[PDB]
Amino acid sequence: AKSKNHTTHNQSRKWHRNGIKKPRSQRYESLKGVDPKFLRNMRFAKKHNKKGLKKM
Amino acid sequence: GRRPARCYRYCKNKPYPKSRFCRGVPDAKIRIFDLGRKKAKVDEFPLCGHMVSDEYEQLSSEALEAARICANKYMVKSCGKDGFHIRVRLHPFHVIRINKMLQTGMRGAFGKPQGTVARVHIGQVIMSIRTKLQNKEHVVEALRRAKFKFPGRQKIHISKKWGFTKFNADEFEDMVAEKRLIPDGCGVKYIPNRGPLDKWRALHS
Amino acid sequence: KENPMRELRIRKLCLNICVGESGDRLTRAAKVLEQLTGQTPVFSKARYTVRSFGIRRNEKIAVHCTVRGAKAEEILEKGLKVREYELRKNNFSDTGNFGFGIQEHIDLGIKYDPSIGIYGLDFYVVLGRPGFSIADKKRRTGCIGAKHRISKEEAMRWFQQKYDGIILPG
Amino acid sequence: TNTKGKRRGTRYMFSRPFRKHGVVPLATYMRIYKKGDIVDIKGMGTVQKGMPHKCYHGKTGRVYNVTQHAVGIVVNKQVKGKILAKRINVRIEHIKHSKSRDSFLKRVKENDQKKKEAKEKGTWVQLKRQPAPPREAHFVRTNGKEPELLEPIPYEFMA
Amino acid sequence: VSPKVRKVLQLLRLRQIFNGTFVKLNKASINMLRIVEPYIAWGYPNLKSV
Amino acid sequence: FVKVVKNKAYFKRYQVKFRRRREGKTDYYARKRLVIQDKNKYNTPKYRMIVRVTNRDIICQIAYARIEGDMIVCAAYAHELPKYGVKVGLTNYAAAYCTGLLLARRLLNRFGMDKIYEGQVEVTGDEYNVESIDGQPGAFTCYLDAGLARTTTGNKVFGALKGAVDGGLSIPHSTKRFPGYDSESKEFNAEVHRKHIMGQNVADYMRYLMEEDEDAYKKQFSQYIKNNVTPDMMEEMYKKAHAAIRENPVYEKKPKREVKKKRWNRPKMSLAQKKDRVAQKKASFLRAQERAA
RNA sequence: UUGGGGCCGAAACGAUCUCAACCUAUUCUCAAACUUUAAAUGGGUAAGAAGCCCGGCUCGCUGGUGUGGAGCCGGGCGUGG
RNA sequence: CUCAGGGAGGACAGAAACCUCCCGUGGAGCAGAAGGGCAAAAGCUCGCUUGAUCUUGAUUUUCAGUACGAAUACAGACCGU
RNA sequence: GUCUACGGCCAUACCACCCUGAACGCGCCCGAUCUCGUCUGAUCUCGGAAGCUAAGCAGGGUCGGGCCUGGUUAGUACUUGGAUGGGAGACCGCCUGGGAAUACCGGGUGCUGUAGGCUU
Ligand SMILES: [Mg+2]
Ligand SMILES: [Mg+2]
Ligand SMILES: [Mg+2]
Ligand SMILES: [Mg+2]
Ligand SMILES: [Mg+2]
Ligand SMILES: [Mg+2]
Ligand SMILES: [Mg+2]
Ligand SMILES: [Mg+2]
Ligand SMILES: [Mg+2]
């Protein structure tokens, strides 16, 4: 009772029925995975952007 | 004792040489490759005749030895034992495999080594006979007799080169006399104009 | 007139006694070189074990020393006084270096102490020129060139000229 | 079946070029990568830390994070029905500035200069890249000699 | 029909046999007509043909 | 015979090293760590003080590296010291200290930072590290490039470092490779270091050779007695040298003059000359055979 | 440079043939688990307004240096490249 | 500091113990199977050591884009050199 | 023209031998009291300046080896797509596009960044 082991014969035709789509390109990608020290300092800059509003 | 040559005729598998992976190969049937008056100078055997394969197939070492024995034994009778030089220009490097049926069937059916064949392309020279210009028809007849020991179809071609060299016979004597070629036993050495001049002085002195 | 930067001098003199065993034999043989030269010698160990010679891997086998300066001149003169200022044509190497071997160290002039006994040793003379430090200084290491090299024929001439020795053929 | 090893089949892929072994040059160290830069990935076997995987060799992505010795790159990866945006941390020796965007930037500055120009002159200059057109009608001068007659050569059995 | 060739035959709007279309010629067009070469018969039309 | 190693196949597979490694001048293993900057510092210059002691000169530079080659921002040499007062012994520890002090004060004069971070004016030999005063521009930070000099206790590459950190630059170091450090007890004595800063070890040698033998004294110190430098006045000579260096460290370039443009070496031989030379050699060789045969 | 047979030398790196290992230029034939080279087909990115461009503000990050980097605002460029 | 190997020398010492000079692109070594990588080193010998320690998250590999294992960049500490 | 310190690309820069080097430099060189390290001041470190370009180094040469770059090899080998093409097969020819590598034969033999000198 030997069976077929592996093939990818119909797979490339199955992939293109709904299409092979690139990931959804959006502006303002997330800062998740950015290093914590620079990410921590950027939050401090955003926290005090309102300080020099009347000079701006 | 062994299988007929129609089994291992076509170049089907990848080349499978004697190496550190394929061990246990029996010795090749042909071990002497060139013979006759092989200790002869260049300028005395100017005529060269080739047996040239017209097919892409495998030639067994047993067939190579059986062909060179027949070519030797005709050329000795025809032109004497010291009037020729036969060189087989095919070495058996492919190893064919045997799967013995003693009953496991096809389970683990990878063959142990059986023998050695030579992978031969179209237009590739099988054997080459050099001799004097008077023994042309004897070379043609000797190669025609040796064609019957090979599978497939072969052609006979009298080369335009001078003996076992790569230089044309019409210009060979002039190129030797201009000292651009130096005799070096069986073949010649080509002298270019690219070395130091101290070898040119030793050449022309 | 020859350039005095090309003057052929003695760079170093290398001495060893190869004893072949360990123990107090090495201590006595090292004491010979220590009282002979005035500096402590250094023990040389075996590279690997061979069973036919009795030696083992990393076992101390020989005792060697290197003498430089004006001390090497007088030690070499004591050696050639034993050798009667003669050498063979085969004692000079291709690089311009020459050595010999002496069979009884007492013949140097060193006194016999009954606890130590008799050893032989061999001397090697490394000649040089002013400028040979190029090949082993750290900062800008370079080759020595071809005209500045010492040869066998030039080392024999130096030995025959300065030490007034003779080269017998063999 | 094959093994699932990390460096399987990378024998020639991660090998150094011929007579280019030894000490890694320092210009690949002292060049600057910022966020948004387009970077192609080429694995080098001399350094072993921060090596990209073999499926990212020859790919191109964009830097999103910069660290002391490495940059993070968003690379597109073809996985079995779809393309994913992968975020990989690659050390700086495996990293090279891609020159694909450089021609586009040199064309952007050329287009902006050529749009500032010919606005006061009132003419209209072509800014699109047209494809290779059919060649224009021209005269070929056979001045003097007639064209050489070519014929097929006979066969020579040089085998 | 091969998939690469199907895509070019759809970008040329030739979705049915014996369909015809006018295509202007450049390098980007010749390199697509080379891909769909065994499946089409193209040429240079006359003014009366247009 | 024996098989020749350097055959054609040896030179076909031969990969040369770097040119500076072949000349031996550069340790690229130390250069990769001394020079490169963290990538999240984003083209901030990473400075280094190069101190190189030749046979007759001491060279002190400060460099930061770009792609095209590193940029020297300030350089001080030991042959500028006869201007400031010391003329003999330009390659010892005190001259290294004066070269480092020149480099430090000359860099601070370029950046306009003379008044802030004066440094240790009255030298002691202690561990001195400059501190950045808040509300002011920060202290200059660079790192020592010792090169291939063996960094043992008492090196002139560390004497130039001591001169720089007393001039006012912030170079991180420990006082272990300064002379005066006793490796037997792991304790640094600053007074022995101050003797080498003021060159009193040379003074003891001159007094020693003067009491031993005047011939060896004249052999070892010929330019000292020529330029009238004595062990009692070397202390005040080096103090006046330090004072003159800190008074005016700005370097004026020697004016370049017009030159007649003479070629001293030989130009490269052209192709036709090389082709004619070998033809003349062959024509001479055949003629010498037909004239002697 | 040592040998396997010698041989005229009692013998000497001597005469002097020799054959094999060795060396040097050549030559015949090969490699899925060799390679200096090296395609065709192929695999990634880019071909703009989420872009360029200037001015100002913030930072506890980074620094010789209102250095560098990042984030914010305010405008100007539409031949939609 | 430079290895493998080779050449020429030196009392016993010879095929092979030890010393010295020269050539040496890696023909060595890096625990193991193989491949890649490596020469003022990643090899050899020394000196000092315990970053084989504590703690969040993120990422890659297998992959369903789940785990485990292994791995990569950081960040917060205390350290070694 | 050229050198020194630090480099970038890492042989058009390497290797072998020969010739020439004015000035500054780089070196060889002379020593071991101090710093430091060894069997040995040979190396390393330190203090020097009598002698010398001998060597290192720089420039140049060799029908030089190598390396780099071209031609030939050759539209050859190979290859995308096509045919109810041939052949008993092995394989081969044609259409449509792309297109190598030896041997062999020529040319070349480091460019350059910052700082500081000499040639005043
Ligand atoms: Mg199934
Ligand atoms: Mg098969
Ligand atoms: Mg170091
Ligand atoms: Mg190290
Ligand atoms: Mg000395
Ligand atoms: Mg010189
Ligand atoms: Mg000379
Ligand atoms: Mg040449
Ligand atoms: Mg320059």
* Other Cβ atoms within 10 Å of F215 Cβ, number: 9
Quote the CA–CA distance of B125 and B52 in Å, as a whole number. 4
Q: Do B197 and F289 touch (CB under 8 A)?
A: no
Three state DSSP letters for chain F: CCCCCCCHHHHHCCCCCCHHHHHCCCCHHHHHHHHCCCHHHCCCCCCEEEEEECCCCEEEEEEEEECCEEEEEEEEEHHHHHHHCCCCCCCCHHHHHHHHHHHHHHHHHHHCCCCCCCCCCCCCCCCCCCCCCCCCCCCCECEEECCCCCCCCCCHHHHHHHHHHHHCCECCCCCCCCCCEECCCCEECHHHHHHHHCCHHHHHHHHHHHHHCHHHHHHHCHHHHHCCCCCCCHHHHHHHHHHHHHHCCCCCCCCCCCCCCCCCCCCCCCHHHHHHHHHHHHHHHHHHHHCCC
- Smallest Cα–Cα separation from C154: which of C92, C99, C79? C92
A2 interfaces chain D, CB cutoff of 8 Å? no
Q: Which of C159, C10, C151, C161 is nearest to C71 (CA)?
A: C10
Residues of F in contact with C134 (CB under 8 A): none
How far is Cα C159 from Cα C153, in angstroms, rounded to an integer? 10
**Do the Cβ atoms of B91 and B27 come closer than 8 Å?**
no
Q: What is the β-pairing status of strands C166-168 and C86-88?
A: parallel
Query: CB atoms < 10 A from the CB of F17, how many?
Result: 11
Q: Are C106 and C112 in contact (CB under 8 A)?
A: yes
Whether C70 maps to a domain, the answer reads: yes
Resolution of this structure in Å: 2.8
Q: Which residues of F268-284 are buried (b: 16+ CB within 10 A; e: fewer)?
A: eeeeeeeeeeeeeeeee
Instruction: Report the 10 Å Cβ neighbour count for D128.
Output: 6
Instruction: Say whether B205 and F289 touch across the interface (CB within 8 A).
Output: yes
Rounded Cα distance between D62 and F270, Å, is 52
The sign of the CA dihedral E20, E22, E28, E31 is: positive
Q: How many domains does chain C have?
A: 1
Please answer whether residues F78 and F58 qualify as being in contact, where contact means their C-beta atoms are separated by less than 8 angstroms. Answer: yes
Return the SS3 of B73.
Answer: helix
State the DSSP H helix or E strand holding residue B186, giving kind and residue range, or none if neither: none
Rounded-to-integer distance, Cα F103 and Cα F171, Å: 13
Spatial neighbors of E19 by CB under 8 A, at least 6 apart, are E13
Quote the ligand 2 centre to B58 CA distance (angstroms). Answer: 14
Candidates B43, B80, B12; CA nearest to B182 is B43
Nearest to B86 by CA among B147, B29, B40, B127: B127
> Angle CA(C20)–CA(C22)–CA(C23) in degrees, nearest 5?
140
Task: Select the residue of B122, B125, B157 nearest D157 (Cβ to Cβ).
Answer: B157
Residue C61 C-beta-side C-alpha neighbours within 13 Å: 16
With respect to residue C77, please indicate whether it lies within any of the assigned structural domains.
Answer: yes
Hey, are the CB atoms on F278 and B197 less than 8 Å from each other?
A: yes
Token pair belonging to B113: 């080594």
| CA neighbor of B46 nearest in space, from B165, B156, B151, B141 | B165
CB C143 within 8 A of CB C134: yes
- The reply to whether C169 falls in a domain is yes
Q: Which of D26, D48, C1, C19 is nearest to F37 (CA)?
A: D26
> How many beta-carbon pairs under 8 angstroms link D with F?
48
Distance in Å, CA D23 to ligand 3 centroid: 16
Q: Which residues surround ligand 2, an ion (CB under 5 A)?
A: B 13
* Contact between residue F203 and residue F93 where contact means Cβ atoms under 8 Å apart: no
Q: How far is residue F211's CA from residue F217's CA, in Å, rounded to a whole number?
A: 9
Q: Given CB atoms, is F4 within the 8 Å cutoff of chain B?
A: no
Sign of CA dihedral B12, B15, B16, B21: negative
Q: Which range of residues forms the domain containing residue C54?
A: 6-170
Is B23 in a helix, a strand, or coil?
Answer: coil
Nearest Cα to Cα of residue B67 among B189, B152, B3: B152
Instruction: Note the CA–C1' distance, A55 to G56, in angstroms.
Output: 9
Separation between the CA of F20 and the C1’ of I14 (whole angstroms):
13
Check: CB of residue C43 under 8 Å from CB of residue C73: no
Residues of D with a Cβ under 8 Å from any A Cβ are 64-67, 72, 76, 78, 80-85, 87
Query: From the centroid of its chain, how far is CA C33?
Result: 12
Q: Is B157 on the interface with D (CB under 8 A)?
A: yes
The dihedral over CA atoms of D111, D112, D113, D114, expressed in degrees to the nearest 10, equals 50
Using CA atoms, how far apart are residues B140 and B180, in angstroms rounded to an integer? 32
Asked if residue C60 belongs to a domain, the reply is yes
| Cα angle value F248/F254/F256 (rounded, 5°) | 155
**Residue C163, CB, strand H, below 7 Å:** no
Quote the CA–CA distance of E9 and E29 in Å, as a whole number: 12
Q: Hey, what amino acid is at B145?
A: R
By the 10 Å C-beta count (0-12 exposed, 13-18 middle, 19+ buried), B27 is classed as exposed
Q: How was this structure determined?
A: cryo-EM
- The CA dihedral of F131, F135, F136, F141, to the nearest 10 degrees, is 40
Structure tokens, B112:
């142990």
Give CA–CA dist F162/F98, Å, rounded: 10
Q: How far is the CA of E36 from the centre of ligand 3 (A)?
A: 66
Is C167 buried (19+), middle (13-18) or exposed (0-12) by CB count in 10 A?
middle
In this structure, are residues D89 and D33 in contact, taking their beta carbons and an 8 Å threshold?
A: no
Contact status, residue F151 vs residue F159, Cβ threshold 8 Å: no
Task: Give the number of other CB atoms < 10 A from CB of residue E35.
Answer: 16
Tokens (6 digits) for F182: 């006793």
In angstroms, rounded to a whole number, what is the distance separating the alpha carbons of residues F84 and F93? Answer: 16
Phi, psi for residue A12 in degrees, rounded to 5? -65, -30
Report d(CA F29, CA F42) in Å as an integer: 23
Cα gap C159→F202, rounded to integer Å: 42
Report whether B57 contacts B126 (CB < 8 A). Answer: no
Residue C40 falls within a domain, yes or no?
Answer: yes
Q: Which nucleotide is nearest to F141 (CA to C1')?
A: G64
Q: Which residues make Cβ contacts (< 8 Å) with residue B55, sequence separation at least 6? A: B120, B122, B152, B153
Chains that contact C by 3+ CB pairs under 8 Å? F
Go through chain A and tell me how many residues it has.
Answer: 56
| Angstrom distance (rounded) from CA C126 to CA C132 | 11
Q: Are F78 and F91 in contact (CB under 8 A)?
A: yes
Positions 222-261 of F with beta carbon below 7 A from strand I are 222-224, 251, 253-254, 256-257, 259-261
Pair F88, F229: CB distance under 8 Å: yes
> What is the helix (H) or strand (E) element at residue E6, kind and residue range?
helix E3-11
Q: Which ligand is nearest to the CA of C137?
A: 5
If one counts every other C-beta atom within 10 angstroms of the C-beta of residue B114, the result is 18
Residue C51 lies in a domain: yes
State the DSSP H helix or E strand holding residue B189, giving kind and residue range, or none if neither: strand B187-190
Rg, chain C, Cα only: 18
Flag if C138 and F150 touch (Cβ within 8 Å).
yes
Burial class (CB in 10 A: 0-12, 13-18, 19+), B154: buried
| Other C-beta atoms lying within 10 Å of the C-beta of residue F79 | 13
Residue C1 lies in a domain: no
